Design a protein around this ligand. Structure first.
Ligand SMILES: CCCC(=O)OC[C@H](COP(=O)(O)O[C@H]1[C@H](O)[C@@H](OP(=O)(O)O)[C@H](OP(=O)(O)O)[C@@H](OP(=O)(O)O)[C@H]1O)OC(O)CCC
Length: 98
């Protein structure tokens, strides 16, 4: 619903060691969806904001979205992009608990 935040991010894969995959991710304020392509109609994965337990920045231009069961690692192109993604998720997380 009105996908406020959109971008191509490098998402960490659980397979292998430090192997990323280019996914087009969107954030509408209710769930974090990632697609194989922005032209793909159905997402490769959906992470509801209710399931999000925390979101924290990483060493490089990277941020972690931590749920109850899994952690998603996304890599941006710049620290500014990472900070915008991380602040937006933190803002929504803070308001969803109030
Ligand atoms: C150092 C060894 C290299 C190596 O092994 O790297 C192996 C990689 C990974 O291969 P694969 O594409 O099968 O990995 C799966 C993939 O990362 C899925 O992510 P999405 O494409 O965004 O759907 C994973 O699913 P989710 O993250 O839950 O979305 C899937 O995880 P699950 O098993 O379903 O929990 C991954 O398995 O091969 C490549 O494509 C990269 C080529 C090397």
């Amino acid at each position: 619903l009105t996908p406020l935040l959109s971008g191509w991010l490098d998402k960490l894969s659980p397979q292998g060691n430090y192997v990323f995959q280019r996914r087009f991710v969107q954030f509408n304020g209710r769930s974090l969806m990632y697609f194989g392509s922005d032209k793909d109609p159905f997402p490769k994965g959906v992470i509801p904001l209710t399931a999000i337990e925390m979101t924290r920045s990483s060493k490089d231009n990277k941020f972690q979205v931590i749920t109850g069961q899994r952690v998603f690692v996304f890599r941006t192109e710049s620290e500014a992009q990472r900070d915008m993604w991380c602040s937006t998720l933190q803002s929504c997380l803070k308001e969803q608990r109030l």
